[PDB]
Paper text:
The HCMV Pentamer, composed of gH, gL, UL128, UL130, and UL131A, enhances entry into epithelial, endothelial, and myeloid cells by interacting with the cell surface receptor neuropilin 2 (NRP2). The other critical tropism-determining complex is the HCMV Pentamer, which is composed of glycoproteins UL128, UL130, and UL131A and the same gH and gL proteins that comprise the bulk of the HCMV Trimer. This elongated heteropentamer mediates tropism for endothelial and epithelial cells by binding to neuropilin 2 (NRP2) and triggering the viral fusion protein, gB, to facilitate entry into host cells. HCMV-directed antibodies isolated from asymptomatic donors predominantly target the Pentamer, suggesting that Pentamer-specific antibodies may restrict viral dissemination, making Pentamer a target for the development of vaccines and immunotherapeutics.
Model building was facilitated by high-resolution crystal structures of unbound Fabs (1-103: 1.9 Å, 1-32: 2.1 Å, 2-18: 2.8 Å, and 2-25: 2.5 Å), which were then used as reference restraints and lightly refined as a part of the complex. Three of these antibodies (1-103, 2-18, and 2-25) bound solely to the UL proteins at the head of the Pentamer, whereas the fourth (1-32) bound to gL near the junction between the UL proteins and the conserved gH/gL scaffold. Despite the ability to recognize the gH/gL heterodimer that serves as the scaffold for assembly of both the HCMV Pentamer and Trimer, 1-32 was only capable of neutralizing HCMV infection in epithelial cells. In contrast, Fab 1-32, which binds to the junction between gL and the UL head of Pentamer, occupies the same space as several of the loops of the a1 domain of NRP2 (residues 45 to 48; 72 to 77; 106 to 110) via its CDRL1. Given that higher concentrations of antibody are typically required to inhibit adhered virions compared to free virions, it is expected that 1-103 and 1-32 exhibited substantially weaker neutralization potencies in this post-attachment assay. Because the dimerization interface is formed by two copies of UL128, it is likely that the binding of 2-18 and 2-25 would prevent dimerization from taking place while still allowing NRP2 engagement to occur. It is likely that 1-32 would also interfere with Pentamer dimerization; however, this antibody also competes with NRP2 domain a1, as we show here.
Residue numbers in the entry:
A (entry chain L): 1 to 211
B (entry chain H): 2 to 52, 52A, 53 to 82, 82A, 82B, 82C, 83 to 96, 100K, ...
Write the structure that this text describes.
């Protein structure tokens, strides 16, 4: 069936800059596309149809051009409410949304402030242990958390999530929790969270000894 | 104009659920209707379309013959019956009208899981030297092992908003959810100001106020 690419996967530009985003098809779809903008927790909003026709009430700074295989949605002067994920969509035959592309505001790099929390003694009574690592007020969004227990790489037993770009400082924050049994927790000594980020010349490590 | 979805809820894997979509503000028979779904943190996925008078039906791959999209041009409603749902179908389910999809609904959330309704255990994330950085301390509340979403969290009954980060929840391997909410405060304020996270899990009728004191 018809599948569509969206390039890039994420984009960053400053307020007033020109944002150009591409969408590709697995077919010659001529000019039969729509583009949508969707903000967190909100339904999509239709912006452009037939590749170039703006919808009613959509600012003139939103423009598109199309050519069967290669399509360009362009925000000609990025405004602060243009922070969203943008989705192209084909309808030359059936309908398929692209993967989408997130657009955030570009600010200077900010390294994360790293904080680490041992599991509470209340939780340890429950029979489980969660170790929490917080990465605060960093930019850009891309960061890597790597859990180590007595230097061992933890892989697959942690989960993380990220805030949306803060409305006034434009940074992200991330929280990762390492889940492990109380019995495994009491069996190891050094618990460490090692952060990789563009603002760090070398990975920063936050660690504690059980006790 | 307005589309209002209904249905939604926790249903067991393999069991049934029907979604409804009421449309106010226009003649319903002029437009084709869509159902579009969105998994947590994933992009829009087109489910199906119904032709303006119901003659032409088309579905997406992942439907795999399990869904059925019908239409009631007299009641201005479209439906989508889901007979044998898989956890892979967990998502917000949107309504949209088409000739582009200009009008959408706010969406209704289908939760497909065998987990039983459960209120969270609120554990402190106590501030310590290893949660401190140059006079800024971090503290929080781990809202662990609850089902289903949502859980709301404020601090000191809403009197504390600056420096709060309440992170998106995550679905643990156990099928229960877990989220954290963290605040950054001055270090020197630790021994003076009291920090309480007010947690509310209405599906389980559980409200918890958890004071977070240092170690």
């Amino acid at each position: 069936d018809i599948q569509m690419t969206q390039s890039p996967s994420s984009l960053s530009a400053s307020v007033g800059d020109s944002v150009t985003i591409t969408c590709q098809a697995s077919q010659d779809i001529n000019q039969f596309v729509s583009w949508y903008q969707q903000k967190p927790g909100k339904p999509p909003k239709l912006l452009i149809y037939d590749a170039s026709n703006l919808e009613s009430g959509v600012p003139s700074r939103f423009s598109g051009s199309g050519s069967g295989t290669h399509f360009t949605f362009t925000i000609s002067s990025l405004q602060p409410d243009d922070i969203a994920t943008y989705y192209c969509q084909q309808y030359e035959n059936l309908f398929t949304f692209g993967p989408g592309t997130k657009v955030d505001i570009k600010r200077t790099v900010a390294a994360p402030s790293v904080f680490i929390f041992p599991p509470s003694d209340e939780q340890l009574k429950s029979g489980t242990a969660s170790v929490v690592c917080l990465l605060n007020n960093f930019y850009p969004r891309e960061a890597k958390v790597q859990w180590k227990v007595d230097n061992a790489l933890q892989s697959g037993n942690s989960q993380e999530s990220v805030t949306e770009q803060d409305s006034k400082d434009s940074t992200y924050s991330l929280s990762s929790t390492l889940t492990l049994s109380k019995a495994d927790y009491e069996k190891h000594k050094v618990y460490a969270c090692e952060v990789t980020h563009q603002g760090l010349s070398s990975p920063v490590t936050k660690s504690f000894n059980r006790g | 104009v307005k589309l209002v979805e209904s249905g939604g809820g926790v249903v067991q894997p393999g069991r049934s659920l029907r979604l409804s979509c009421a449309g106010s503000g226009f003649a319903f028979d002029n437009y084709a209707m869509h159902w579009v779904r969105q998994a947590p943190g994933k992009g829009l996925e087109w489910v199906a379309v119904i032709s303006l008078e119901g003659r032409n039906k088309y579905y997406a791959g992942p439907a795999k013959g399990r869904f059925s999209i019908s239409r009631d041009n007299s009641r201005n409603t479209v439906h989508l019956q889901m007979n044998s749902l898989r956890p892979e179908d967990t998502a917000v389910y949107f309504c949209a009208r088409d000739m582009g999809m200009d009008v959408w609904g706010q969406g209704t959330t289908v939760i497909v899981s065998s987990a039983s309704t459960k209120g969270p255990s609120v554990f402190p994330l106590a501030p310590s030297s290893k949660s401190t950085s140059g006079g800024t301390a971090a503290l929080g509340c781990l809202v662990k092992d609850y089902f289903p979403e949502p859980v709301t969290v404020s601090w000191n009954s809403g009197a504390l908003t600056s420096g709060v980060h309440t992170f998106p929840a995550v679905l643990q391997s156990s099928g229960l959810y877990s989220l954290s909410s963290v605040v950054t405060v001055p270090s020197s304020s630790l021994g003076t100001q009291t920090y309480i996270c007010n947690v509310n899990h209405k599906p389980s009728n559980t409200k918890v106020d958890k004071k977070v004191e240092p170690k």
